């Protein structure tokens, strides 16, 4: 019942971002695109980094390496909370889709 946005185009971009998060571990091509957005915009997940805890095939206590403040190979495996971006991506990436 609750919704993060009211505009139709903004809420559908939000679901599109969350949909490709589900396809992150099922496709390497999909995962590479999201790694750029999370790296360039310095963010993790849709609204928070804790969104990854709900993604199947995403290991426990693991976030994508692009979520780390400094992107190194394997930095997301057994990550530390103080070494990743906690803020989500949806608002800062597509906020201009609001009315």
């Amino acid at each position, epitope marked *: 019942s609750g*919704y993060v946005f009211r505009d139709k185009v903004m809420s559908e971009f939000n679901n599109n971002f969350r949909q490709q998060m589900e396809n992150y571990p099922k496709n390497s091509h999909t995962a590479s695109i999201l790694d750029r957005m999370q790296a360039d915009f310095k963010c993790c997940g849709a609204a928070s980094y804790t969104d990854w805890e*709900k993604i199947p095939s995403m290991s426990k206590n693991r976030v994508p390496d692009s979520c780390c403040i400094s992107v190194t190979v394997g930095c997301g495996i057994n990550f530390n909370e103080k070494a990743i971006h*906690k803020e989500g991506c949806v608002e800062k990436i597509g906020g201009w889709l609001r009315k």
Partner: nanobody, 115 residues
Framework: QVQLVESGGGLVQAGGSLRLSCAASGFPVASGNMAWYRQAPGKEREWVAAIKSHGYGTKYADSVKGRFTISRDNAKNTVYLQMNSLKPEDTAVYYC????????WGQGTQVTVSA
């Protein structure tokens, strides 16, 4: 925009269970410090359950530890309050709050436990 609409309140017997929901509109629950309050008529208002933003942890009042469990679903942007082993001392109107600089709350929902 800060909307908080409590629902799920009702009447249950002593020792039963009840689940409250707090449909928040206008902000993501995953990055918001949210807590469940309650106030019975005659008594003073009090906070019972809480979940901080991101993974900063949850917190519970001592009178409800182990019985109540606060949860956070992102697909519906809703904070839940699972209330197990309810006591007649838990009869109150339950409100959900949000702390984002200031405080915002909803209308609340009535919870009553018989016997």
């Amino acid at each position: 925009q800060v909307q908080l609409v409590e629902s799920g309140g009702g009447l249950v017997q002593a020792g039963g269970s009840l689940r409250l929901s707090c449909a928040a509109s206008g902000f993501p629950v995953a990055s918001g410090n949210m807590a469940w309050y309650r106030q019975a008529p005659g008594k003073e208002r009090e906070w019972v359950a809480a979940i901080k933003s991101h993974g900063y942890g949850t917190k519970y009042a001592d009178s409800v530890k182990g019985r109540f469990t606060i949860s956070r679903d992102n697909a519906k942007n809703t904070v839940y309050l699972q209330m197990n082993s309810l006591k007649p001392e838990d009869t109150a109107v339950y409100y959900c709050y949000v702390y984002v600089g200031w405080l915002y709350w909803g209308q609340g929902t009535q919870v009553t436990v018989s016997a």
